[PDB]
Design a protein around this motif. Sequence first.
Motif, mmCIF file in Angstrom:
data_model
loop_
_atom_site.group_PDB
_atom_site.id
_atom_site.type_symbol
_atom_site.label_atom_id
_atom_site.label_comp_id
_atom_site.label_asym_id
_atom_site.label_seq_id
_atom_site.Cartn_x
_atom_site.Cartn_y
_atom_site.Cartn_z
ATOM 1 N N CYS B 25 16.358 -4.775 17.846
ATOM 2 C CA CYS B 25 16.461 -4.742 19.220
ATOM 3 C C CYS B 25 17.841 -3.675 19.359
ATOM 4 C CB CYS B 25 16.996 -5.963 20.114
ATOM 5 S SG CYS B 25 16.879 -5.811 21.817
ATOM 6 N N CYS B 30 21.973 -8.620 21.720
ATOM 7 C CA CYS B 30 20.603 -9.093 21.498
ATOM 8 C C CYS B 30 20.280 -9.304 20.048
ATOM 9 C CB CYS B 30 19.209 -8.555 22.120
ATOM 10 S SG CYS B 30 17.907 -9.627 22.003
ATOM 11 N N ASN B 32 17.796 -8.586 18.372
ATOM 12 C CA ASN B 32 16.543 -9.573 18.114
ATOM 13 C C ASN B 32 15.662 -8.757 17.001
ATOM 14 O OD1 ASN B 32 13.411 -8.967 19.004
ATOM 15 N ND2 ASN B 32 14.073 -11.233 18.927
ATOM 16 N N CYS B 48 11.583 -5.604 24.211
ATOM 17 C CA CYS B 48 12.086 -6.953 23.463
ATOM 18 C C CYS B 48 11.399 -8.019 24.203
ATOM 19 C CB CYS B 48 13.506 -6.715 23.299
ATOM 20 S SG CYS B 48 14.378 -8.409 22.645
ATOM 21 N N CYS B 51 15.245 -10.519 25.294
ATOM 22 C CA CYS B 51 15.818 -9.803 26.476
ATOM 23 C C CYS B 51 14.788 -8.915 26.882
ATOM 24 C CB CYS B 51 17.204 -9.156 26.189
ATOM 25 S SG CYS B 51 17.026 -7.371 25.311
ATOM 26 N N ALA B 54 15.251 -3.862 27.130
ATOM 27 C CA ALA B 54 15.630 -3.184 25.891
ATOM 28 C C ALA B 54 14.598 -2.471 25.330
ATOM 29 C CB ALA B 54 16.506 -4.015 25.106
#
Lengths: 444, 133
Positions: B25, B30, B32, B48, B51, B54
């Motif tokens: 991410c 985040c 991620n 993403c 979230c 993004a």
Amino acid sequence: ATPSQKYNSRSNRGEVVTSFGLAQGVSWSGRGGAGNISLKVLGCPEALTGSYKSMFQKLPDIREVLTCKIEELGSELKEHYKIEAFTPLLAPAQEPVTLLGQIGCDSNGKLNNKSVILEGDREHSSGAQIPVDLSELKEYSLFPGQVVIMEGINTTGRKLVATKLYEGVPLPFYQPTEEDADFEQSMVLVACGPYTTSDSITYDPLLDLIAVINHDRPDVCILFGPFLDAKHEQVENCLLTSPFEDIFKQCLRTIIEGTRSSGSHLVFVPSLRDVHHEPVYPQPPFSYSDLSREDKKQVQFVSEPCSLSINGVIFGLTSTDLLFHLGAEEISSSSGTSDRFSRILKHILTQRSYYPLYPPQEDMAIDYESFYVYAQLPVTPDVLIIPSELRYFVKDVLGCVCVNPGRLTKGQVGGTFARLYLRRPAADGAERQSPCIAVQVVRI
Amino acid sequence: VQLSNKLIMDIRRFIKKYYDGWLICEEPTCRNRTRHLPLQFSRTGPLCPACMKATLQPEYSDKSLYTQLCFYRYIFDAECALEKLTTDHEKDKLKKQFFTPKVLQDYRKLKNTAEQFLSRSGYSEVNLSKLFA
Ligand SMILES: [Zn+2]
């Protein structure tokens, strides 16, 4: 010294570990190179001819391959089951509705019945994902990457509760021609790597495999990888004095001058564990130029995976441990009395692809651009050759004889190879008639 | 032989790392990291799943892989390493003292070991059909 001692010390050579079809003795022997032998590449553009195209994947290009994979199977199952229309995932509906999508997981952990999600197609659901509830389903068998039609209720638009799961429909078998029915008895010997024990480099399993080939006098000899295993401890320690490129030449010429007297056709199919070759799935056919005129008539290079017609029988040749690819991350509703290897084989045969699993595991490279054009079933193969690290087994699933001879060598304990009989029976009859009546898996 | 073999393992490790497909991410909050590629795409690219606002970016971009391959090709490319010298006298002095035909052959062997991977599989090929049609 100590290396290869265990391999030589065993004295249990000879006994058959399993058989399928009709009872046969030990004197398995054929005519070898005599008669007419037809080894033809069939299906899509033949088993890819060039090496490959590139290693650069545009991110917005895998989506079209995935969309085609979902949509073709969905439309075929819609025509088979006569479903009127599909429903988007995000569209609420109180009445029971049919959804089209792909099974997947919502995390990076092992898939469980609670965490099963359905990801829809772009045409209908615009690539949405919704969790599904399997409590109200009697029987199911789901793995990530499977394309099915799911009947259920989606009232709130955020969760779909199952009511019925449609069974996958395999593609119809190959239609034999009148020319294929005039042939004689054919033998297919199958061996899979590794060809040496996990602590020595004498390649003695390769040597006595060649000896067995010479004594058998078979018709076709299919050799799978890994000829040069990527997990052999000396490979990663770079302690050798010869390049694996040259190690490839001596490994080739071993079999080449070992099987000249036998005269049987050789089909060498690579494996993803071949460290010396390009690590792309599907893998191109091997490159070798030190072949004489006599050898070119007996040595044929076929890519991995591929569908090869041997004497009018569609053998599905794959080196990936697809059984371990699938059954290791698949769930089911019944565990008391159920045959596992059979249900994974059925799932492989019904998804119309050589590798339905999406996503794959941590370590194996697939190029999706050619996955759509070089990893599909043209027709349902009559015999499946699927080596695995699991136990050897030959079983009839969906009218198809699937053979799993396993590895020729398993660490410090020996493995198994297989030999198959094939002929074409009378065209008339009760439709389905397996050409491969007899299979015999015997340990080396 | 050992140098080429170790280069083989290194390049295999790099290409498998690229094909792993790890995405990260872009948002610092985040971070991620997922292996599954979501089908929810934004204008820039993937969206993403943790979230909602993004863009996921590949951990190992194709530019990084191509740069690494070019670095491996360049570290064993004596042909372009000799012409880089501004003086011909020093180039000849270095060529005649160590760069024997056997030494040049070994360096070209390493360069061809790289060029086998760099030859057909690539990134330098531009499809005109996709660019125009
Ligand atoms: Zn995020």
